[PDB]
Amino acid sequence: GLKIGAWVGTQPSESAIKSFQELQGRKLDIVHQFINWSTDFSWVRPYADAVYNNGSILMITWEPWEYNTVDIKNGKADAYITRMAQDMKAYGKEIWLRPLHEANGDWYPWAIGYSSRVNTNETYIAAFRHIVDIFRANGATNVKWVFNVNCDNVGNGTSYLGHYPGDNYVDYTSIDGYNWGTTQSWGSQWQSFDQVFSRAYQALASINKPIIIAEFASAEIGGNKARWITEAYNSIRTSYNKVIAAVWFHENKETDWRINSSPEALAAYREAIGAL
Ligand SMILES: OC[C@H]1CNC[C@@H](O[C@@H]2O[C@H](CO)[C@@H](O)[C@H](O)[C@H]2O)[C@@H]1O
């Protein structure tokens, strides 16, 4: 059955996890957290403990603001990577790790579309493989590797699979995507779940790996968010059959992505996610 996850809008302390479970009226199967590449596992541990004590899987989006793909492929981050691998192995529990993500966008300093042009398919693949190699050399077989694409290719040189590091280095593929509604002054428009996700899914469906929707959410403005939610989960279950997990992005950020941005959105979300 479809696993239900969330980034709960703050680092997932015990109380933040429990509070979200009360909010959505259901167990979180996956708890999502973002960290950077100057964060030791000792900082992560208490969060990890809360997640596993709850009976959930921890997915960590591991964001190398501190190293780009050239730095990483050349081994400049290896001391930090090695420590993380050793500490995660020692921890021993199943952790889903999503390094270097949305690399077919242009907003991250490790992304192929990033305006400095420093990141290429080759440097990206070499970087990703290097990370995995180090984890494997340190026995961290408990760490599952999540490859990721943004729903849209944004920026020069971007593609869904040009930076794909190979089935030998990947446990899950994943897609991120947002219905921005009419909230953005550049000219965003309301998009249904299908309109957001269908292109990326077609590309990833050609890969023999299960798929996670690692980040998704909808604005309130420019359409009916409650109906969007109902239809999104229906779409996932009906036509996105390789998708095994749906992980909401619950934060009032660029717009109000929260499941409780309105009472009607919340009601729809509670019903949509199901018993399981
Ligand atoms: O634009 C929509 C989202 C698209 N995906 C990444 C999100 O940013 C991430 O958001 C996280 C939670 O705010 C932060 O901890 C990370 O540093 C940051 O990279 C965006 O808000």
Curated annotation (Swiss-Prot):
Disulfide-bonded cysteines: none
Active site: 102, 215
Record-annotated GH26 domain positions: 16-269
Task of the protein: This enzyme catalyzes the endohydrolysis of 1,4-beta-glucosidic linkages in cellulose, lichenin and cereal beta-D-glucans.
Family: In the N-terminal section; belongs to the glycosyl hydrolase 5 (cellulase A) family.
Official protein name in the record: Endoglucanase H
UniProt gene name: celH
Residues of the full protein shown: 30 to 304 of 900
